[PDB]
Amino acid sequence: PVPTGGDDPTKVAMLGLTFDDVLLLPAASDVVPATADTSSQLTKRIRLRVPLVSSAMDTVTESRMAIAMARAGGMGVLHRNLPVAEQAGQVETVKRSQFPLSTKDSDGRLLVGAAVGVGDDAWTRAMTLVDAGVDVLIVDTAHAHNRGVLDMVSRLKQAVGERVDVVGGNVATRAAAAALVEAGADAVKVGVGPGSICTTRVVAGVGAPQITAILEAVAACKPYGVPVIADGGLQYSGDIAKALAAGASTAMLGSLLAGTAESPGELIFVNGKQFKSYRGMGSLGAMQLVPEGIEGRVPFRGPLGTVIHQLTGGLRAAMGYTGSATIEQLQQAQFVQITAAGLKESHPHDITMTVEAPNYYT
Amino acid sequence: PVPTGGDDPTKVAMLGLTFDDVLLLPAASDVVPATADTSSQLTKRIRLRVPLVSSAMDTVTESRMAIAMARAGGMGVLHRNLPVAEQAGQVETVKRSQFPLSTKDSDGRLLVGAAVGVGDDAWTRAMTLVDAGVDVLIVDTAHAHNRGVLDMVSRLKQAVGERVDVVGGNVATRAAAAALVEAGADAVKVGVGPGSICTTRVVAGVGAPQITAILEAVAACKPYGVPVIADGGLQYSGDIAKALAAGASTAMLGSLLAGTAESPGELIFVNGKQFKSYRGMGSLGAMQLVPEGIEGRVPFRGPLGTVIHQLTGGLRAAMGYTGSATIEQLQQAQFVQITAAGLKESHPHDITMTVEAPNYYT
Amino acid sequence: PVPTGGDDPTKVAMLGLTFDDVLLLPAASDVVPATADTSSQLTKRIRLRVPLVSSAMDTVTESRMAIAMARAGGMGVLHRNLPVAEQAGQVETVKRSQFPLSTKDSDGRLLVGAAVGVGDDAWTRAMTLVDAGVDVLIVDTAHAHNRGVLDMVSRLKQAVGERVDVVGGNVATRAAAAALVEAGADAVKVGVGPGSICTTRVVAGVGAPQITAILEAVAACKPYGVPVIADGGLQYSGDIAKALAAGASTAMLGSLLAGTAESPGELIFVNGKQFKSYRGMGSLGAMQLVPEGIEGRVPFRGPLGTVIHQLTGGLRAAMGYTGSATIEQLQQAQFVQITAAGLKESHPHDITMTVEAPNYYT
Amino acid sequence: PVPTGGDDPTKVAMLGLTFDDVLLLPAASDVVPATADTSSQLTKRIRLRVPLVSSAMDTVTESRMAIAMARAGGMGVLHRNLPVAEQAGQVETVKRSQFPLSTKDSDGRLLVGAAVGVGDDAWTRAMTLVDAGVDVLIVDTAHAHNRGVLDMVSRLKQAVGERVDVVGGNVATRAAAAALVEAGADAVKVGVGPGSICTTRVVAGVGAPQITAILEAVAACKPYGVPVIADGGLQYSGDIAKALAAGASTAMLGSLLAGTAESPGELIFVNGKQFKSYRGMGSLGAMQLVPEGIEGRVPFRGPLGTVIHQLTGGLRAAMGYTGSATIEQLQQAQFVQITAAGLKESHPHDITMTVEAPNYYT
């Protein structure tokens, strides 16, 4: 019999690795961290100076956050939890608005992104957003291997292909990424359940660990040149370095940017400290059922520029350790799989911390 | 030599997996969660609309709980901690009893099951229960591979085989499932020690992880058309989805229904909060000795209908993710094996929950 | 290269399993738990009705504990931290002494054993103890593969081999067990580091997991018919069942008996709860340097007979589950390896225990 | 495909083991712990009586620590966070200064070492240190596979290779160790991330577990007779024994020596208990940016001699257990891999320690 039970060797397909299961192996390096080139292709036509994209969530990205992310070298994606006219107004506000790395189009204006669903109402929203000058559309769905999501992606590529870039929803397998690539998507977003606010892997018991999912999606997408975006489950800059090394071209950040000042919402004072609200788009409050997210609060951090600077410094240090001149070389790095004891050895241990580092906290 | 010690390669037969060791892999889907069919076979001749069955415990299932569970779309199994006359009276009360999914017999009365032991006194109890008009008998023992349990199953199926269905006791291996099938069981119940109130794996050191046990039992029960019931260890709707995807046709629930309003027992107030008593049938109090269970308390949950609806919504979401229109299709889904890091990535992390979700609580 | 580093495949010899890594598999059973025979061989000539032995520690075994253990069906081993005259007096007190299971010699006197070290002083102590009528001598060391221990075992076997039995020191490998058998020992004690009070694996970094060590030692001792004693690391009756199923013949208990009324020492009262002292023989206090043990307290348990009955009931339940009429049949049961999630499923989970079980506590 | 994902079997190159994943197997022994010889090679020409070195940290080693370590039988390495003239003054102070094991040169003067960076200013500091009477230069970096570090090592060996010994920076792979040996290093230091105060594996996500790294580096250094120094991650004397058995010849200590009276800094009182500062060299304060270390405090220990004696006693116990007369014989001991349960069993468990032992802390 099969060692794990039954007579079917393909019942348990594979062992899945996540960010905490692997470490990057140092290699022969001739690269100073300051000279590392952290530019990467977000889509087949858009290249960012910093490969970080803000999450399309109602407590993460709005006009201010989108403008700040575009100025810092990345991009912001406005959420679709607003009326269509309001979303178009936010797109116009971003496009209408020191920062040498800022992302700009052929007209010299900042780049913005918008998220739409699936359906005729979503089609009207997408048409309104495209008419307002949006550059990239995201078909933001929880299960992108559904036939409706693929049909919507094909429709958008057929209609507004010459003017915008269409990014498919979340996938976690090789077959889903291949289907999205065949459907005509310009970029594939990866991750089902690893988000810090998600309960999908608990409520439905469905998902896949992020590192293995990224590897599978890259094996499905790289021959066609389609970029891969790692979405959800990133907590440190080492996580971003690992996600890029596993094959992803861009990383989408949630809770790391929710505690910044540019994020929408009011500051909450609790017990002499500061926080702000963070919740999933599938949470009960956001969808007003069977929710697949939770509501919570993250500690307050400050300006987005400092956070992006620290994350980029960590990524530059990783590139220096691996000897990667560009991201295209960082994607050829190798991993070492570690156990739980190795995981606790990686973090600071046997020490009582008396002052916090800019890039680390418990 | 064997890597784990000794010269016998069969001393450590296999590596067992449980619910938290696996995740369900998304597949190509054309299924909407609202339009998925959750009906499944409880026995070879009885089909439920919601594949959930209440545990035969004195703190979980009685007349009220059996009626509520039959109305909700599943079934209840009355415990055998009562005198035979009282259990027969409970059966008659259930049979003497808005609800589109209610499970009914040919005459229009609600279905109900009843648990029996092993022996001549249990034989008299079984005859009384059959006379009172029960639909399915459960030979409720902790070890179904014993000779007495098989003899009792054969005797019951020869006596009242044409009238009621007989479900075999708890098994954890393929050989025991095959023995139950050969003895003439209409359904096989799986699980030895995974219950939240069990100490059998600690007191006796005997057991088997639930996912591996379900796979092993299904490998022997499926060829003969005998359904498999997964019993014990389920704490989320994702666990139910994983159990069904492993081959089981129905799931039997304990502590998940012990805190509802329909379960027997008075409310308990601790620090201003509500709880209800929950204890194993092998506990010292319940068996009144070497006990194999403990006595405890679980938080109050409210009406059973809300709990059943939340669990069924989670199962429907899992069916949508896997592209399974029917439970028979869900039983063909695949798994991915995860580590402890993947397990803590599955749950919400790096967040302080500010408001509790209807289907998730830490 | 080897996947764990280096070019030598024998550098990391094996993967070691302990009690928490394995579970007993149920088998076809015709055994009532009350009809199982728990008798087992302590040495090649001594048979115990209950296969449990007390540890030769100054906080566990003295004359009272030895008498109680012999009255319950097992045996006690007197510690050697006393002067030779006092130890001989304790042996005489035990021999000079309602209990149908009492283990007696031909003359109807309770059996007892004593511990000796290595050296000429140990030779004088051993001869004095043999004069006082001791029944079995334990060469109580921490490393039985040392030349001195084997030489001493050979000397004792040549001198007083017919009168008494000689038990070898603690081993952890197949080669050490083979050397002890060749030296002429009548029983082999297994375990290096798993003691609840030991720090040998942390201070010296030397040890082996108990299940793997037992399997390896049985691979060498069984062909010659030399019994195996599992010593250290046992916390539950399921652990005793696992140790006996792995191949061992008897289990030597430490902390499980230190909290009884018969153990030497006085009660300790702290915050309305009762404790008593427990310490290793390598501790700084016991050896009065680089200690290899610690000093602590364990909760009070009451009379030893109740504890012995609970452990025997757990063992009988395990034998009933595995279909083992005798311990010799229990030594052929199969294991299943479990993960950490399986381990947390094995214990009572997701519950708030209200009343204490006689054989379980968190 | 690869069971972890993708089509490249070399993406996840290997599985790394740390100190907590292995144990030393006992073997046939004719060695008394008090008669073992712990002398080991520091470099190709320097042999220490106690194979322990102090870290080049501004909170660990200064003149006093170097003198105490040289007297105790090891050696000290002065940190380079000081002005060049000040560090040369510390070197002269150490050279200008019961202890039968003290390490001395051919002129009866205490040995000492100093750390240098990479660059022309580092060249000036190195030349000043050589002219000031240093015995060994440690090219102290974080990534020694960089071209600059190899060039600096080659330049130092070409200039003052006949007067001083050059030890390369930290490596974690076989290729890096081979490159350092080819560059002309007298010794190779191993470890990237294991430090108790490091955050490199979190900020950059780059590193390797220590046991696998030591094995890989020894696989490249042993054929050429170049010693390997294990730096970082050692918390117990068992860790030192494991590192020596993996192939390392010496172990550099950080936090283990940062709480002694001879370490630089001042005593700190918190709730009646004594602590003192310990911070990483890449921490924010130490480099005064993206720090790769943290600042904290460790409990006060006392005189260095007692700590060194306890560590050497643990090492001698390990040598006695493995039957290793010399460190060269300890470097051939075998390992056994353990699980998380094995690690829990190795430490004291199910006990409430009431008095702290000299060599173990809870």
Ligand SMILES: NC(=O)c1ccc[n+]([C@@H]2O[C@H](COP(=O)([O-])OP(=O)(O)OC[C@H]3O[C@@H](n4cnc5c(N)ncnc54)[C@H](O)[C@@H]3O)[C@@H](O)[C@H]2O)c1
């Ligand atoms: N599912 C489990 O793992 C588990 C474990 C312990 C108790 N329980 C529950 O406790 C209640 C009583 O269980 P029970 O089986 O002890 O009832 P019981 O004492 O009435 O036993 C009935 C029959 O089961 C068999 N049996 C049970 N345990 C055995 C063992 N250890 N060895 C050999 N044969 C054995 C015997 O043939 C016995 O006559 C039931 O409600 C049961 O579901 C369940």
Ligand SMILES: NC(=O)c1ccc[n+]([C@@H]2O[C@H](COP(=O)([O-])OP(=O)(O)OC[C@H]3O[C@@H](n4cnc5c(N)ncnc54)[C@H](O)[C@@H]3O)[C@@H](O)[C@H]2O)c1
């Ligand atoms: N990434 C995740 O795993 C995840 C999980 C839950 C929610 N979310 C977020 O919540 C928001 C709403 O997501 P949504 O998908 O629930 O909204 P939605 O109702 O707009 O779903 C969009 C489409 O996704 C597909 N889909 C979604 N869930 C499915 C399921 N269970 N089975 C089959 N097809 C399914 C369907 O084709 C549907 O039309 C988005 O912002 C999304 O990113 C994400």
Ligand SMILES: NC(=O)c1ccc[n+]([C@@H]2O[C@H](COP(=O)([O-])OP(=O)(O)OC[C@H]3O[C@@H](n4cnc5c(N)ncnc54)[C@H](O)[C@@H]3O)[C@@H](O)[C@H]2O)c1
């Ligand atoms: N069972 C264990 O793992 C363990 C561990 C430490 C101590 N202890 C207990 O502590 C007491 C003293 O133990 P002890 O045996 O160390 O004391 P001891 O001084 O009586 O040692 C007796 C003999 O054991 C051998 N020995 C012990 N440790 C050795 C080592 N590290 N290397 C080589 N040979 C070694 C030597 O031959 C020595 O003569 C005993 O009661 C013993 O049971 C037990």
Ligand SMILES: NC(=O)c1ccc[n+]([C@@H]2O[C@H](COP(=O)([O-])OP(=O)(O)OC[C@H]3O[C@@H](n4cnc5c(N)ncnc54)[C@H](O)[C@@H]3O)[C@@H](O)[C@H]2O)c1
């Ligand atoms: N061993 C470790 O893992 C580690 C990590 C961080 C810091 N540290 C300690 O902090 C201090 C300063 O460390 P440092 O090496 O950054 O000092 P540094 O800034 O003086 O660097 C010296 C040389 O190391 C190399 N180097 C260091 N980090 C590199 C990277 N990320 N990518 C490429 N090359 C790199 C370069 O050749 C550089 O010129 C030292 O005392 C060092 O031991 C050690």
Ligand SMILES: *c1nc2c(ncn2[C@@H]2O[C@H](COP(=O)(O)O)[C@@H](O)[C@H]2O)c(=O)[nH]1
């Ligand atoms: C699950 N996932 C959800 C939900 N809303 C958004 N998301 C996903 O999480 C990502 C961010 O996760 P972090 O780990 O916090 O960075 C988002 O980009 C989105 O893909 C939800 O309700 N449940």
Ligand SMILES: *c1nc2c(ncn2[C@@H]2O[C@H](COP(=O)(O)O)[C@@H](O)[C@H]2O)c(=O)[nH]1
């Ligand atoms: C162990 N298992 C026991 C006992 N009484 C009942 N059971 C089993 O547990 C199931 C419920 O488990 P939950 O995890 O709480 O859902 C029951 O259906 C029954 O099979 C006992 O004393 N010990």
Ligand SMILES: *c1nc2c(ncn2[C@@H]2O[C@H](COP(=O)(O)O)[C@@H](O)[C@H]2O)c(=O)[nH]1
């Ligand atoms: C380590 N082991 C020690 C010491 N003294 C005795 N022992 C061993 O432990 C066994 C008891 O272990 P428990 O887990 O408490 O059952 C004893 O029988 C003996 O073999 C010591 O100082 N260090």
Ligand SMILES: *c1nc2c(ncn2[C@@H]2O[C@H](COP(=O)(O)O)[C@@H](O)[C@H]2O)c(=O)[nH]1
């Ligand atoms: C990471 N590692 C660092 C830093 N400064 C020094 N080190 C390394 O850590 C070792 C200390 O190890 P312990 O575990 O504390 O014994 C040092 O010897 C050095 O090699 C730093 O900022 N980050």
Ligand SMILES: [K+]
């Ligand atoms: K670390």
Ligand SMILES: [K+]
């Ligand atoms: K359990």
Ligand SMILES: [K+]
């Ligand atoms: K999650």
Ligand SMILES: [K+]
């Ligand atoms: K221990």
